[PDB]
Amino acid sequence: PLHKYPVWLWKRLQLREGICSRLPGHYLRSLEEERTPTPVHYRPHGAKFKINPKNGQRERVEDVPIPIYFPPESQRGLWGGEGWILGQIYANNDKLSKRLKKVWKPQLFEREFYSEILDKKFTVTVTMRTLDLIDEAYGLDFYILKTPKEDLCSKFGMDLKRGMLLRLARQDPQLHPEDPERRAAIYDKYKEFAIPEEEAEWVGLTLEEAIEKQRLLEEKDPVPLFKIYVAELIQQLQQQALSE
């Protein structure tokens, strides 16, 4: 036989049933959106049309991203979108020679970063690209908030984003409790990234984490039927008195 829906649509159907239905709309739209990551291991053409050198004709060109493998240890650091490149090479760059397996690994470094919003220092494994992105963003706090989810390529980076967004959303007074003037200055510096606290709590959460969080919010002890029946009995007696 045949399935009513295509197989690749089964995942999206599951989001319309069960506990995933009751997830916040703003969170669900984030999962549906799939932006193209900033090119890292390949150079984009930069133009939609190029003149072919041979026939001298205008031919459409497209950017095909290089597949990237992110090791699980990359989720505990900030690699800046870099990852392992699992591919093939030709010996001596000659197509008539053997096709060998080649893996390109980023050079990882251990660095300590201070977050102004979080008022804490983190020892994060980063690459040289991550340092450049932070330098171009003028600070770690700007880099975390500005960089999209698809470009961070790190669960820890998204967790840092949620922490910063929560403090900005709440105007949390735990940041320098004894210096109210200094606390307001930092919040004013990053006021452009402020979002409502309801949305900030769901930023960076995976589907499994969101489901568990939603389940806990909806988890409540059932109301005993004694209390429910008392309310109906009391209401009905009042209505009887009015008719009399």
Partner RNA sequence: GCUAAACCUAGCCCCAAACCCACUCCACCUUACUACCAGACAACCUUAGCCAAACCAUUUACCCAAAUAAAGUAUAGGCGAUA
Helix, strand or coil, per DSSP, at residue 166: helix
Q: Which does 41 bind (CB under 5 to 8 A by kind): RNA, another protein, none?
A: another protein
- Assigned token pair, 191: 């006021």
Task: Give the nearer residue to RNA in terms of CB position, either 14 or 38.
Answer: 14
Of 26 and 99, CB closest to RNA: 99
Q: Measured between alpha carbons, how far is 27 from 21 in angstroms, rounded to an integer?
A: 11
Task: Give the HSE-up count for residue 74: Cα atoms under 13 Å, Cβ half-sphere.
Answer: 18
The partner in contact with residue 64, picked from RNA, another protein, none with C-beta cut-offs of 5 to 8 angstroms by kind, is another protein
Q: Which one of another protein, RNA, none is in contact with 14 (Cβ closer than 5 to 8 A by kind)?
A: RNA
Q: Which residues, numbered 205-234, are part of the site for RNA (CB under 7 A)?
A: none
Query: From the list 12, 50, 58, 170, which residue makes contact with another protein (rule: CB under 8 A)?
Result: 12
Query: Buried b / exposed e across 197-231, counting CB within 10 Å, b at 16+?
Result: eeebbbbbbeeeebbeebeeeeeeeeeeeeeeeee
User: Does residue 170 contact residue 197 with C-beta atoms inside 8 Å?
Assistant: yes
Per CB under 7 A, 19 contacts RNA: no
Contacts of 171 (CB under 8 A, 6+ apart): 187
Q: Which residue from 11, 14, 76, 114 is in contact with RNA, where contact means CB under 7 A? A: 14
DSSP calls for 84-95: BEEEEEEGGG-T
Q: Out of 86, 195, 228, 230, name the contact with RNA by CB under 7 A.
A: 86
Considering only CA atoms, give the Rg of the chain.
27
Q: Which is nearer to another protein, 85 or 118 (CB)?
A: 85
- 137 token code pair: 């963003």
Amino acid, single-letter form, for residue 225: L
* DSSP conformation class of 102: E
Q: How far is the CB of 18 from another protein (least distance, A)?
A: 16
Partner whose footprint covers residue 62, from another protein, RNA, none (CB < 5 to 8 Å by kind): another protein
- Which residues would be at the binding site for RNA (CB under 7 A)? 1-8, 10, 13-14, 16-17, 52, 54-55, 57, 59, 69, 71-72, 86-88, 90, 95-99, 101-103
- Which residues would be at the binding site for another protein (CB under 8 A)? 1-9, 12-13, 40-43, 60, 62, 64, 66, 82, 85-90, 93, 95, 99, 102, 104, 106-107, 127-129, 224-227, 229-230, 233-234, 237
